[PDB]
Amino acid sequence: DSCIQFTRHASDVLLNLNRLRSRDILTDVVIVVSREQFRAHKTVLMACSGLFYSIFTDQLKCNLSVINLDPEINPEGFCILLDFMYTSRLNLREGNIMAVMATAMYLQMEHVVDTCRKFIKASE
Amino acid sequence: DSCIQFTRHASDVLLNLNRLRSRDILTDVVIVVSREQFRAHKTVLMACSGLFYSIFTDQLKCNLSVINLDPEINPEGFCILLDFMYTSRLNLREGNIMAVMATAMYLQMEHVVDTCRKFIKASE
């Protein structure tokens, strides 16, 4: 087509979605991790994670307001990944990289799994 | 902080939100324009428009599944703007610029209003 494009549009949308998350506006699901609860928007989770995409396209699970993650999932790893979903920023540190990569593999967040593999390979 | 950032994350999120819109997945509102109906996600509309932000933060209107726009709003202008919200791409043409700018002023989409004003000024 002959469209024009606003370079900062996608980033401004994500920033606003994160402001809604901060203020708990229109959040429609609770993610339960080892008795730690995280409120979020189903559409943002689906847009970021192959696991959430599969969960919320399921005709029965699409209607659930609570999702319980596998007990092996670390709440801090999940929190770091949820923040990444809403900001594009990943707080990757020596002390959390193993939990973050394990959580990203479970959530099916391929780009995160890729940078974790590379950061681990550089330290060996 | 010491975060790393994935450059394409915001764009990939918006692309996935638009794929959900295309497939009518988790859309939670109908926008009615001069008897033309558009299905969308409330959070994306709020993230893009000062008008939708104000509507869906209202304690009564936040729960509505149908929103009727002012009858002066042109359905094509709305359609072009809805596409822009979900893609960052604006189909601005000589034949639609007046309807698009009027719709963007009503929806409170300041960056769109800005490029319409500039494109109009260049033709005078």
Binding site: C3, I4, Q5, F6, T7 | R89, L90, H111, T115
Partner: peptide
């Protein structure tokens, strides 16, 4: 704004 840009030409994509």
């Amino acid at each position: 704004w840009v030409i994509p």
